[PDB]
Amino acid sequence: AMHEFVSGTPGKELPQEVKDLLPADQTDSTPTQPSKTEVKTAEGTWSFKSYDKVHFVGTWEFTPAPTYK
């Protein structure tokens, strides 16, 4: 079983901090969870949504950093 990640936020590509969480392949199913489900970047927060199914595709969503006005 192999894992892959995708962004579920329109127009936002995955950052390296998310790609660094990709699990290893499972040897010859239930997905391996990422080590953490929230990643902070300079621009905001990425949150793991879920896997959909062997290839497991894990969707991450982005929330921009809050602005103060």
Author numbering: 542 to 569, 576 to 600, 610 to 625
Question: What did the study's authors say about this model?
Answer:
Here, we show that repeat number variation in predicted bacterial surface proteins is more widespread and we characterize a third rod-like repetitive region in the Streptococcus gordonii protein (Sgo_0707) formed by tandem array of Streptococcal High Identity Repeats in Tandem (SHIRT) domains. The structure of single and tandem SHIRT domains from the streptococcal surface protein Sgo_0707 were determined. We call SasG, Rib, and Sgo_0707 “Periscope Proteins” due to their having variable-length stalk-like regions that define the distance that the N-terminal functional domain projects from the bacterial surface. Taken together, these data are consistent with multiple tandemly arrayed SHIRT domains from Sgo_0707 behaving as an elongated, rod-like particle.
Defining the structural, rather than sequence, repeat boundaries in repetitive bacterial proteins is challenging. For Sgo_0707 the T-REKS server predicts a repeat frame of 460 through 543 and 13 repeats of 84 through 90 residues. A construct based on the second repeat (residues 544 through 627; ΔN-Sgo_R2) was folded and solved to 0.95 Å resolution using X-ray crystallography utilizing ab initio molecular replacement (MR) with ideal fragments. Based on the significant truncation of the N-terminal β-strand (Inset), we hypothesized that shifting the frame of the repeat by seven residues toward the N terminus of Sgo_0707 would complete the fold.
